Design a protein around this ligand. Sequence first.
Ligand SMILES: Nc1ncnc2c1ncn2[C@@H]1O[C@H](CSCC[C@H](N)C(=O)O)[C@@H](O)[C@H]1O
Ligand code: NA
Lengths: 265, 265
Amino acid sequence: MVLYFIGLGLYDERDITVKGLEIAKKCDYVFAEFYTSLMAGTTLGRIQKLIGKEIRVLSREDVELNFENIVLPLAKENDVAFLTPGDPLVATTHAELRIRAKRAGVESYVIHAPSIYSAVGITGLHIYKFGKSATVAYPEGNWFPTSYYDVIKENAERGLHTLLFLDIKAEKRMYMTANEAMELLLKVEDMKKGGVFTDDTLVVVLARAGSLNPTIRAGYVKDLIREDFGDPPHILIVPGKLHIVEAEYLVEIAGAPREILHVNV
Amino acid sequence: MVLYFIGLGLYDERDITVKGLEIAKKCDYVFAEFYTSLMAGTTLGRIQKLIGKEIRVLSREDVELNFENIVLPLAKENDVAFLTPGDPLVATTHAELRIRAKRAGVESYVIHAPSIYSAVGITGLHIYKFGKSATVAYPEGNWFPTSYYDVIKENAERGLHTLLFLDIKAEKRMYMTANEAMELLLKVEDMKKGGVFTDDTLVVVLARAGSLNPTIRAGYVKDLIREDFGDPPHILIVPGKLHIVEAEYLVEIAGAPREILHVNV
Ligand SMILES: Nc1ncnc2c1ncn2[C@@H]1O[C@H](CSCC[C@H](N)C(=O)O)[C@@H](O)[C@H]1O
Ligand code: NA
């Protein structure tokens, strides 16, 4: 009669919370989805071994189209868990799944875990200064989307930071790198010419947040565009004007050029 | 000779990640602060029992003025942990402590935990739609903080949601309620008269996120301003323009007036 939405956290099998693990262990059935994001520091086998339960993986279609025929039926006479990378309900369409549970007469509870939305605090950028967030998508065929560029412009214009999620092809296990994102934004800039993203724009790259050894780098596009940030996933951030303390952290912790202490403050 | 910044999560001792617990258990010394937020479902005693270590709690003064004299010295010859509610770097000035660590020749690592910043997902509001955040601070003497009002105005004009962290005076055991925040906002509205926050404004309240049964309520200020939302901590959210599914969730899960199902596109 109960469905538990449990987050797996940021990077590996140990990023689930103690509460999430203990509840998952008591569930009769355990489902998971890795189409919204993958757990790059672990494997399904390692997550299964930790939880001590067979984990049934669900595809995007399984969830978006058939959540009520696959997960909810079991949740009516058993305790069921639905595992997702990061924090539950962060993915845009997941909150609606709780409405489906209610419509099916199934109680649901949420067990939180770390999300990139809060983990970016490790960049030293003040959380309150982040504005609207966006995703950088690959142009395809006759389609060249550029809304994420407008988001950066509107945020920066108001002195706010912009969190940029990079395109991911979950099943194909293909990720957009920070380098690719930068190249794309420069191309968008050439078309928009709004002076929003250029070789002189200061950016911050966060890779493998959650890991004990994440990659945190800050610098100008002209210098970071061809830098190796390691294995994905990569997160790109275009900060707005910096508080001197944010600048100092980026220099001391993220290897940013001392130049930002006067150019971007 | 390492220093770990480990988050304890949203509500109780089980909101710590497995990674954080495993590491905290093996540290020689464990420090913590409980002035940046309130974990309403646990006690120092329960946390110590879980980690199996005696925890020395530090005051804001101990940290802000003496972190390098109290904690850092021990990190030179031992493994030290510094625990905090939620995520250690979110809506705190703790990130700056990593700079102090580096200057003392002490390596530091960050272990994230669920944060109220991403827990907003449980309100059904798309997290990417949140704009600049702010804190409703208690007036002090003749000083009456009001900038948080302008933040709401700025986001609202852009159709973005506004997360409002609420004040806390841990040494006085004072935790601002959503009701108190609403009263203060109405007072600022009377003074500024910008039509930003009135009795007809739609607001969302999230209390004790992390617990299994948090209070999630949505409705007009005129109706919620005197409602009992349970024990602290609370956060207040002023949504911007709503998507159809966001409104549906607020009505179905947060008990909002069915009339908000209607969106003025
Ligand atoms: N479990 C919880 N439920 C509701 N609000 C919470 C909360 N935990 C923190 N807050 C809100 O955030 C304020 C503390 S700000 C510090 C936040 C913390 N680092 C984190 O990562 O969550 C509180 O005064 C309250 O308004
Ligand atoms: Na945000």
